[PDB]
Symmetry: C3
Subunit: 492 residues, 3 copies
Amino acid sequence: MKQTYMIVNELDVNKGGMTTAMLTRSKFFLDNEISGDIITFDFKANYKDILKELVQSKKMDKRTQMHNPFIYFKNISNLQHKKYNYTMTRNLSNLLKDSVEIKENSRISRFFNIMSGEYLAYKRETEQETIFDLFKNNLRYKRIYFYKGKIVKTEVFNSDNNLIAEQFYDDNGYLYLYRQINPEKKSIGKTYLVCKEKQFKNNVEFCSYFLDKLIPDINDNIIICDGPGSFPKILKTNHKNVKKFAVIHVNHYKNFDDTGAVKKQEDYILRNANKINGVVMLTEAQKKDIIEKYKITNAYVISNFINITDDYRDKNDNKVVGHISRLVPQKGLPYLIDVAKKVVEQDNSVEFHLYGTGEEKSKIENLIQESNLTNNVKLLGYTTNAIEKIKDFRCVISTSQFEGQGLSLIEAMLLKKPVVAFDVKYGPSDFVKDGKNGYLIENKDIKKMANKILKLLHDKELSKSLGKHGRDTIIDMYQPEKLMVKWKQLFN
Amino acid sequence: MKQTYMIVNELDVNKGGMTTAMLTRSKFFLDNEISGDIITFDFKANYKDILKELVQSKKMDKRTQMHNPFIYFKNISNLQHKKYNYTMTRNLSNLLKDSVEIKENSRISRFFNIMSGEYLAYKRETEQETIFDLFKNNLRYKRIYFYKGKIVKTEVFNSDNNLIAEQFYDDNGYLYLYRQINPEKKSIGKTYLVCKEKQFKNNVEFCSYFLDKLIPDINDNIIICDGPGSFPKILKTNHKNVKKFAVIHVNHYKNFDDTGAVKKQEDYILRNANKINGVVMLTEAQKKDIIEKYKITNAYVISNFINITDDYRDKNDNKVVGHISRLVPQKGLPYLIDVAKKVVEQDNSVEFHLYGTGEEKSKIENLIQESNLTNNVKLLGYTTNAIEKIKDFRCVISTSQFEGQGLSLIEAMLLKKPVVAFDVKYGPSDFVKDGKNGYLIENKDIKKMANKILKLLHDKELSKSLGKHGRDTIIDMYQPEKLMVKWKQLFN
Amino acid sequence: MKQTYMIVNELDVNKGGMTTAMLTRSKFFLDNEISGDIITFDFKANYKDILKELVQSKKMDKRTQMHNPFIYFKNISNLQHKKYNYTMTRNLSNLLKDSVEIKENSRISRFFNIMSGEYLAYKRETEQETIFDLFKNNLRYKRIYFYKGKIVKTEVFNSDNNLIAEQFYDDNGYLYLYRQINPEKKSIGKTYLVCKEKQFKNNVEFCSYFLDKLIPDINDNIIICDGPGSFPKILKTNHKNVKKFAVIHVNHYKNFDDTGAVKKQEDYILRNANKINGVVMLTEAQKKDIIEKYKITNAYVISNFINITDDYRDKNDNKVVGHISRLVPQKGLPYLIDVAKKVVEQDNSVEFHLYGTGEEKSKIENLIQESNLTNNVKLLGYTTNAIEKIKDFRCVISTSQFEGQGLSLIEAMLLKKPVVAFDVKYGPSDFVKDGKNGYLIENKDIKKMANKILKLLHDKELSKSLGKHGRDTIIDMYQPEKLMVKWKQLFN
Ligand SMILES: [Cl-]
Ligand SMILES: [Cl-]
Ligand SMILES: [Cl-]
Ligand SMILES: [Cl-]
Ligand SMILES: [Cl-]
Ligand SMILES: [Cl-]
Ligand SMILES: [Cl-]
Ligand SMILES: [Cl-]
Ligand SMILES: [Cl-]
């Protein structure tokens, strides 16, 4: 049974894109006797609960395992000793002994000695998460983190209360990892594995060491670096038999850059692509651009797996248009506010409920009132669920100028719902067949977009027909069975 | 018996203006069954001795009491415990045990360990005031203050030897107050009352808490905020029955500001005058300007109390003219040096002994030599006593461009001595009746001032007559009995 | 027996100029019943070994003694106590007890506690020289130096890891010296002698105290300040009978300064020359310039002692020209590279092996390749020995624009070897008699220098004759016996 290892840095809840796609990939892979496991490199004491919530929310398969350096070496150190280190816990209590706890809030509480007249510590008692900011001469020297009534991590700060070193302890109370962080650049430098008496120059060396000790050197094990920041770690691994790949999930080109400069991260994975066993893209256009600029031969194009769920039941209604996209400078609805203003001049009754939070939200809502859209638009409260939310909604908007793959658009095709793409990143040129299915209009085409959106709403049955065969288009193009065959060819 | 509470921040020795006026006010108030007590907010271990010296120097009545937050809460904590905290004292001795005291001076002495090779502490043994600057890694971490062989206050410093926190102990050796000071802005921030397990955001909240716990909420108790910086503390008090007033002792207008901008402090007490029960002024002109710009209705005009002392006995003499005013940029004798130079060209024998120290003193004395007045002027050594000093002197000068009330001028009227005002702040338009009494000449009138001063000296008996009825003018206008009647009307 | 005291700051190995000259001076002085002792002011635990190596390398006489403040007061403190201070040593071991030593290199080793999770110390175990950089909150607080398994010196650093204080211990483990260093200006300030409970404002006061306690106040003892930086220390000595002198070994004029500004150090020794009993120069020209600008009367001219070694035996050969001079901006071979390029255009076979390291070396070697001299020149590897190295070499180059005394040139005269001076500092106008002996050509005379160098090589026997009587010239002018007679006249 082939053991694939999707490489990322973090895997938290309420996070889509690569995260969700990797979970989907794992399930489909395992369905064809190919163990799908995720490799993270972040520290989270709540990781157990996070992954549990995900599995329970059908956001990941139970077979999908998560390998993390911290947990791995924690278990190694847990077996080195037998007794519990009560030293730190006792010392903390003896410091806050006969102290006066001045509670500012219900959680916030500061400790003071009346006998030594010294500020001892600060405590924010969050649910089973007490954080003791220890003080010396009214200056923070340490910050003890707690979980399940056990010290999980301590942090030493400098004269500017900036992190200079982080420390990680096992479930026996002993140190296994010591990382020195540069106050400037905020970069994890000299890393020390005290559980194996080892010294690393960077976290890259530590993460590579972890991967070399976890993944055995056989062609039975594949490595799929989905994250563009974890690539340096898969490039330094001392493996010579394990195949390594790099899945690109986004536009390699920098956001809003007419210059046509490629993102530093993606540039590296494409310049040093002569070292990896393949670079996987989702769009044929992405391939053309990359395989021209970098002139690479390992440019393979296999799209992301997508579940067809079920068939909807003629859910017809209309109260508001919807972008259904997280607020992003270019990958949001910036110019779509102007489109809404134009539609308001025709039908003022038409509202606009676009879900998703972000930084642009502020200016967008301010510009709404400016363009007399205080009531004419009514953005949703980033409702977690979307499938059932807009199952009855049609005429979805897509003013993205830099998309990597139209996931939401391909989902609406299976939801028999029309779309209004701007065909500015060729992420929807594959899905929206213009007249046939959806509306692949040009970029900054507010005029044409307005007419299309209004007509689409008016012609209900007609628009449904366009989307109904659009489902079949998606089903055919992105056929799960066909996709994993391509993966197998690349892997083996 | 009405209990008035004059609110100021500090009350030290060798300090006039509000300080002296408040003491005078208290005496006169008490003479009419109205307890006159002063409220300070500063920390001074020597306060007992300071107030004793004042009472002994007839600079305050024995009935005038002083309420201070530090002392109040010190007594509260002194009753919480029974034994003495010898911990700190013993620890200090054990640190400086078998140490080598290298005495730089008679007072300055540094301690060094030959066994640990560490700089322990620095000690400046002033009379019963040992200050131990404790050192760690040749960097000051603490500064222990001593009084009556008891730790009174400790101070924790940062990497730049700048105060980050101050601590105050009781007479039992326990902490009752902890104040965090921002290294920048040098402002007392988060304040902690460990004697009552309370937390304050600023010293304003702590001082308001003190006033709310001291002054009961009845109309029998009045609050007279004489200090312009203590007003925010009387504005935040949770009293709803206690009447609050604001006495202005100075020109609200900024010093040397043709722009006519009002001092930020005074501006606040006049913009938020709609909250207090009255704003007391000393000059009718001050009222007109304030009651116009701020358009307030609670603008009352009652002048400061002044003692008539006794009647002089024709003390006639002349060796030097005298300004008898502390060196101040505009409230000093800047242009009066040019006046002196002009008089020298007429009578070179005429000397100029003006008492009072300041920053301007340097340039003034340098400009003296420049204007050939090295000997032609001979400033006095800021002799504390003035009443008896210039009792025999006549032709006093007043080149103040921004005075709030001519106290020295009104004193010379009772001393039957002529004056030479510049009528530039209308502080002397009330007293100096031009020809009748003194010489209320215009501003920058060196020419006219010279002629007036010379003539005044020459005509002795005539000048005395002008000042003799000037005493009666002051007596009538500023009649003690009449002033306290006005106060009573405002209070009740 | 007269006791002369040559005053310098440091006396390390592989160092010429004053250092070597002082050793030579001492030997010759002692040969005439005049004790020659060197006074240093630097701390070096290896000083014993350094001076031993020198004596063994015939680089100093066994009679030449070295007096150092550190050693002097160390012996004083060694007699104050009897037992050894094991405190520090034990405390160091107890800190690194049950610690995990993570060895980065063979020497570099860091210590970590798994029970307290704290970075303890850093250790670079050089041959019998363990340096423990003690750490607190991942910040360096101390640096313990070791020698013969004994703490010799500790150093306390600040928040910027910059020295704030240095500490020195005796052979019994007790502190005798504590010096506070300003992080800015890097200057030893307040100095404390804990062995004699004394306090000094600077190291000047401490070094003067040392000299006042070492040298008795009689005319039997002379002080020769050879070092220009130790002069302030001989100017503040409380001696009134001991004669003080100042030997100038270099050009008082600043390097590459057409302005003609005199070096601050030398300027001081010549402006405050009215205080010392004489200023000794090596060049009559130096005297003229100094005795004109400063108009001093104590300007004496006695040249440095030089050993005539033996007579060479017609060592004739030629493979490369040689400057035999440490790389220095103006006192090096900067323009001599252009001279070499010109010679290459005539004889490309001619190589150029100039010995001596420096900063200019980089640019010089780069400019070699630039001027097609990658192979045409071949600088030697700064071979310590020079006497025997180029004993067979002739036509030595001297493109120095600011020399104080042509030592190497005077050595080649005794080695019967021609020279090519630039007569730009008049250091060789005394030695090179142009046609008669060597070649005293003008400055920036690449043209003339080229012709001279080539002709000199061609005419072997002739060039030898010029150098053979040049030895006699040096022997006569710089006659050892004659020089010490001049010294005696000045001393007594
Ligand atoms: Cl135990
Ligand atoms: Cl216990
Ligand atoms: Cl490699
Ligand atoms: Cl006890
Ligand atoms: Cl005791
Ligand atoms: Cl309010
Ligand atoms: Cl012992
Ligand atoms: Cl032992
Ligand atoms: Cl002197």
